[PDB]
């Protein structure tokens, strides 16, 4: 057997470039009893990988999740053809003993793409689900500010908020994303790169301020939003993508006087905090909302394992509309 794997040739300086990755071919050992050989069907690239890569040794495999098919099996629980979620990194083939896999929902229908298990009905959707419903604690009727609102996480945040009865103000990085989310029904959507002044745009979008802030971006953008949070406003700190590729010092922080006077609550979280029955129920809620049309999905499918570095870099620069997925 053989496998193709993407490794970190060099730690990223600023945004990644092609020279930071190295494609290597490896010979897999044969199966031992209780193991299976997994062939990747869909592999995800996600913003967190820019940060997690700093913990790698140079030469290590890039981390990441994938939907995979069993092609050979010495384990009866996983017959040839079983579909699983695995995280062996950017690799076409891998060997697993079975304890590091997750079977898809038993109720998974064939009317929606399998790749949604890496998106709206997978890790990004769960991040939106718990970030908004638990960390932000929306009950209905709130005004919610979400940035990267067309990304894998933000798009789910806005649509869950809408089905809960919230007003949604979304910030995105391109006109095409603005038009898409406006057609979905978000109350206000704008391109942060082209606004004449961010402060006036946010003020007009909600004169009374914002109850909740789902933050994927960080940086100066968040300083402006903090200046328009209502008293006791809740901020879910999910990501800081505007800073991940920074080469210089971080931008100034928010004005402390505003944070204190408004008594803001700001909590950071990672989706893996929730496991067991909480995680499983969130997945079923996301599945039902998708099947009812309450949550639309959009994917940017890229063909070819060899193009995975390009998919990752394009995703970081915001060039793709929809969850970026690499189809092997």
Which tokens in the block code for residue 266? 């700001």
Which tokens in the block code for residue 136? 């932000």
The 3-state secondary structure of 169-215, one letter per residue: EEEECCHHHHHHHHHHCCCEEEECCCCCCHHHHHHHHCCCCEEEEEE
172 binds, among a copy of itself, Cl ion, none (CB under 5 to 8 A by kind): Cl ion
150 binds, among a copy of itself, Cl ion, none (CB under 5 to 8 A by kind): Cl ion
Instruction: Kindly tell me which of 7 and 127 has the beta carbon lying closer to a copy of itself.
Output: 127
Burial (CB count within 10 angstroms: exposed 0-12, middle 13-18, buried 19+), residue 263: exposed
- How far apart are the C-alpha atoms of 10 and 299, rounded to whole Å? 29
Is position 75 annotated in a ligand binding site? Answer: no
SS3 at position 308: helix
Q: Return the residues of window 259-278 that contact a copy of itself according to CB under 8 A.
A: 259-270, 273
The distance of closest approach from Cβ of residue 312 to a copy of itself in the complex, given in angstroms and rounded to an integer, is: 18
Q: Taking CB under 8 A as the rule, does residue 30 contact a copy of itself?
A: no
- How far apart are the C-alpha atoms of 73 and 82, rounded to whole Å? 10
Among 30, 79, 253, 304, binds a copy of itself (CB under 8 A): 253
- How far apart are the C-alpha atoms of 161 and 128, rounded to whole Å? 10
Among 113, 158, 254, 322, binds a copy of itself (CB under 8 A): 254
Is position 261 annotated in a ligand binding site? Answer: no
- How far apart are the C-alpha atoms of 91 and 89, rounded to whole Å? 6
Which tokens in the block code for residue 151? 């990304």
Is position 302 annotated in a ligand binding site? Answer: no
The distance of closest approach from Cβ of residue 269 to a copy of itself in the complex, given in angstroms and rounded to an integer, is: 5
Instruction: Kindly tell me which of 149 and 287 has the beta carbon lying closer to Cl ion.
Output: 149
Q: Taking CB under 8 A as the rule, does residue 255 contact a copy of itself?
A: yes
Instruction: Kindly tell me which of 279 and 298 has the beta carbon lying closer to Cl ion.
Output: 298
Instruction: Kindly tell me which of 257 and 292 has the beta carbon lying closer to a copy of itself.
Output: 257
Q: How many residues bind a copy of itself (CB under 8 A)?
A: 30
The phi-psi region of residue 137 (left if phi > 0; otherwise alpha if psi is between -120 and 50; otherwise beta) is left
Is position 98 annotated in a ligand binding site? Answer: no
Q: Which residue is nearest to Cl ion (CB)?
A: 150
- How far apart are the C-alpha atoms of 5 and 61, rounded to whole Å? 7
The distance of closest approach from Cβ of residue 151 to a copy of itself in the complex, given in angstroms and rounded to an integer, is: 16
Binding part of the chain for a copy of itself, among 14-22, 248-256, 296-304, 319-327 by CB under 8 A, reads: 248-256
Binding mask 227-246 for a copy of itself (x = CB under 8 A): ----------xxxx--xx--
Is position 317 annotated in a ligand binding site? Answer: no
Count other Cβ atoms within 10 Å, centred on residue 258.
14
Instruction: Output the CA torsion 179→182→183→186 (10° steps).
Output: 150
- In the block, tokens 């210089």 appear at 248
Residues annotated as binding site for NADP(+)?
Answer: 151-154, 177, 192, 216, 238-244, 269-271, 320
Contacts with a copy of itself by CB under 8 A lie at: 51, 218, 237-240, 243-244, 249-257, 259-270, 273
């Amino acid at each position: 057997s053989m496998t193709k794997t993407w490794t970190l040739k060099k730690h990223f300086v600023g945004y990644p470039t092609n020279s930071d990755f190295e494609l290597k071919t490896s010979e897999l050992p044969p199966l031992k009893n209780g193991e299976v050989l997994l062939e990747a069907l869909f592999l995800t690239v996600d913003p967190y990988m820019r940060v997690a890569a700093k913990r790698l040794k140079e030469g290590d495999t890039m981390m990441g999740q994938q939907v995979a098919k069993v092609v050979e099996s010495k384990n009866v629980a996983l017959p040839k053809g079983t579909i699983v979620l695995a995280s062996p990194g950017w690799t076409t083939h891998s060997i697993s003993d079975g304890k590091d896999l997750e079977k898809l929902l038993t109720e998974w229908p064939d009317t929606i793409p399998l790749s949604l298990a890496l998106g709206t009905v997978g890790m990004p959707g769960l991040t939106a689900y718990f970030g908004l419903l638990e960390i932000c604690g929306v009950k209905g009727g709130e005004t919610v500010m979400v940035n990267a609102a067309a990304g894998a996480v933000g798009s789910v945040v806005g649509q869950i908020a809408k089905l809960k009865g919230c007003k949604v103000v979304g910030a995105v990085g391109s006109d095409e994303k603005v038009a898409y989310l406006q057609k979905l029904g978000f109350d206000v959507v704008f391109n942060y790169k082209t606004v004449e002044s961010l402060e006036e745009t946010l003020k007009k979008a909600s004169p009374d301020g914002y109850d909740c802030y789902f933050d994927n971006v960080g940086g100066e953008f968040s300083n402006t939003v903090i200046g328009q949070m209502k008293k006791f406003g809740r901020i879910a700190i999910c990501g800081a993508i505007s800073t991940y590729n920074r080469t210089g010092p971080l931008p100034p922080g928010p004005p402390p006087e505003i944070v204190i006077y408004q008594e803001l609550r700001m909590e950071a979280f990672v989706v893996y905090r929730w496991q067991g029955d909480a995680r499983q129920k969130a997945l079923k809620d996301l599945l039902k909302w998708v099947l009812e049309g309450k949550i639309q999905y959009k994917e940017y499918i890229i063909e070819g394992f060899e193009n995975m570095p390009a998919a990752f870099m394009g995703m970081l620069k915001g060039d793709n509309l929809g969850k970026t997925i690499v189809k092997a």
